[PDB]
Amino acid sequence: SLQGIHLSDLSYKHAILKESQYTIKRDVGTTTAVTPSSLQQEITLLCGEILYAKHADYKYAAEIGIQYISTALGSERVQQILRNSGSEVQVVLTRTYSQMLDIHGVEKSWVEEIDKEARKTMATLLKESSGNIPQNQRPSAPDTPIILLCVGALIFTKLASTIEVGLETTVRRANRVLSDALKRYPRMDIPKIARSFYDLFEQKVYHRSLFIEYGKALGSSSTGSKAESLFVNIFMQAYGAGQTMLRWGVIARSSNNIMLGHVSVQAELKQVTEVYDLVREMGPESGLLHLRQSPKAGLLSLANCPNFASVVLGNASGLGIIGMYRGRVPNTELFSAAESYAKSLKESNKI
Amino acid sequence: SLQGIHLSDLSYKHAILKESQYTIKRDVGTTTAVTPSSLQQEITLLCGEILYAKHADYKYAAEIGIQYISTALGSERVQQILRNSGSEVQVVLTRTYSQMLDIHGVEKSWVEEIDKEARKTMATLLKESSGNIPQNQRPSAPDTPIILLCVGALIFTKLASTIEVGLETTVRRANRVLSDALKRYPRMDIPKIARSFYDLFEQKVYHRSLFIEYGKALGSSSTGSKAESLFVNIFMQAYGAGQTMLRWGVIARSSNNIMLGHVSVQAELKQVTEVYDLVREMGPESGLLHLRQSPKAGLLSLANCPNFASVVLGNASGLGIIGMYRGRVPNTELFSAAESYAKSLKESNKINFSSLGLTDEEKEAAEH
RNA sequence: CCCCCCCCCCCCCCCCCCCCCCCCCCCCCCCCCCCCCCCCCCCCCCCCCCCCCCCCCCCCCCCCCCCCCC
């Protein structure tokens, strides 16, 4: 008889963020550098120069990476992407001078420093090598911009946490992942390059969705480079951004944690369901919402269900996944219980 | 046999408020300021100036915030929104003089005061800092209008209660929420800024739906600011506006409060159902109805079911949610009963091995 | 390889119909009382609350098929 007492609030909450026929025009005066497709070889060399020598400053390292993306996506197709990201920012086509590159926002002095320092290192090494430097070790190698962007991809994954946390993870993984790249360019300062990328993603927010569009575009192509196929694979491990709680939620169900049967947790079932059903309603873009720093994101918060969150985290702790997750535990009691069951489950073998 | 005795009155009540082919033209002579998109940098600076220094008067602080929304939404797209909100109010495009901003309705004297006072504070501080003030601490920082609007967002949530209640909540939450903004602009007078916003939302009612449209628009964009993503998240916690009773109603069902089974409560079932079914009939706009101060709102009243309301509130009291809710309790008897059950429920720990769907070898180990 | 026999068909008888019988046929207007409807009560609202935070390149073996007869 008592049916009909139900509000699908979360769906309506999302539905309201679609009804906006009006469009936001933020970043009214802003200008960013774009490189035409024609200058892809020149920007490739500059990328290689950053990796090849141990430089004094790695401030614009990230902007150079974005400039390669620019050449790869389109001379002027980039403006379209940026305009469509919600930012009304204007683009500036980078020119040539004497031969060098004049990148908008990038100090001419910095460009010259990077070039000068790299040539100095090439001369020192060519004397030692007895005039013999193979193609794969030169800043001219075509995969050098991809290598640069792969460091950016690693900081892109940890955009969900501290500027600091990301640098740890970036360095650790870069050692295993960019193993061979580091063999050829041992002078690449992963921490400084990764810092330039964090600074860039934080300041030029529109470059987050430009990076996503490069990833999406690269993911589509028939033939990719060995370096390119790595980039996308780093980008994929970045999909469950800020939604670590929902994925650990399915893990709690898969573990059949008896704490998910607790009366207080049972009470939150409808809210939990609503969140997972919103993911399905939003489809594929749902995952990278947090990564884009989208205001829409956060509707996928499990704040409405603290007892469920407690059990999910407990289960993760018991299975030994939790690691360094700072996520607050509302019900300490439920957490400990879920943890105990999961630890007993962990050891036990059944068919 | 006697089943055809049924009137779906509440649906018809709503249906009548759709049949209006005729449209109301209120605010016949009224004029409000709009800022063209071109002046977004100038209004950004002015917003920062409000936060940056401790000012004498924060009267027009809210109107300045609306002016940033104006630049963000559209040079002239704003007039469309206001006209479509039901208000026949006319817009006035704000100009420049010498360089300053001439905002319609905003005293030139006030604009100059805010600017003057901010420059004075910048000079005092630059002497102390030894000429070193980082970008993030200057009134020029691009997130300053968003910060200003976030104080407005907090007062927007508590538009359902007193001008007073809202200020408490705004101040409390602003301290935790705008934590870092306050670090850079410690001179921002949250209570005066929040008061300007309450006054504005109460006087210029059309600005309520303009704020909603900014929120809706911001919620849609691909890349938002850290400040922008906060604004929408404040705006979301504002969705269940004035409908606190219906949401606590679902909580009473989720708690499986045995008082919802009382014969007198059972009698009100059809009215209760009618209200929740009207929410579904109205869809997403249903929630923000009370927030818009829409005359349509109030059809979502649980006045028709006093015994149910009593149980819902009792259950909320027992679970310890009720807090500072002034909502009248018609049946004191039912309330106390629902409260007792909910308090007993609150403490009690039980396990549904029925819900989990485990093997009786996993259900075996669970008993242990 | 396949195929390999035998082999016209038909052939009787036989008109059909033929009786009887018009149908219908009674009765019968309908209507007819009472009766305005309404009548109470009722502004709604009122609490709390930014989210996020772990880890993780993938890949890595081996392999022509076919092969008779008719």
Residue numbers in the entry:
A (entry chain H): 2 to 99, 112 to 364
B (entry chain G): 2 to 99, 112 to 381
Text from the published report:
HMPV (Paramyxoviridae, subfamily Pneumovirinae) is a leading cause of serious respiratory tract infections in children, the elderly, and immunocompromised individuals. In all members of the Mononegavirales, the RNA genome is packaged in the form of a nucleocapsid, a ribonucleoprotein complex consisting of polymerized viral nucleoproteins (N) and RNA. Besides protecting the viral genome from host nucleases, the nucleocapsid serves as the template for transcription by the viral RNA-dependent RNA polymerase L. Nucleocapsid assembly necessitates a pool of monomeric, RNA-free N, termed N0, which is kept in an unassembled state through an interaction with an N-terminal portion of the polymerase cofactor P, until delivered to the sites of viral RNA synthesis. In conclusion, the reported structures of a paramyxoviral N protein reveal two distinct conformational states, N bound either to the polymerase cofactor P or to RNA.
By exploiting the ten-fold non-crystallographic symmetry in the rings, we were able to obtain excellent electron density maps at 4.2-Å resolution and build a reliable model. The observed RNA binding mode is similar to that seen in the related RSV N-RNA structure. The RNA wraps around the N ring and wedges tightly in the cleft between the NTD and CTD of N, which is lined by positively charged residues. Similar to N proteins from other members of Mononegavirales, the NTD- and CTD-arms grasp the neighbouring protomers, thus facilitating assembly of polymeric N. The NTD-arm packs against the flank of the previous protomer (the NTD-arm of Ni+1 packs against Ni). The CTD-arm in turn latches onto the top of the CTD of the next protomer (CTD-arm of Ni-1 latches onto CTD of Ni). Upon RNA binding, Thr257 contacts the backbone of a nucleotide instead of stabilizing Ala254. In the assembled, RNA-bound state these interactions are broken, with Arg186 and Trp261 now positioning RNA nucleotides in the cleft, whilst Arg260 instead fastens onto the NTD-arm of the neighbouring Ni+1.
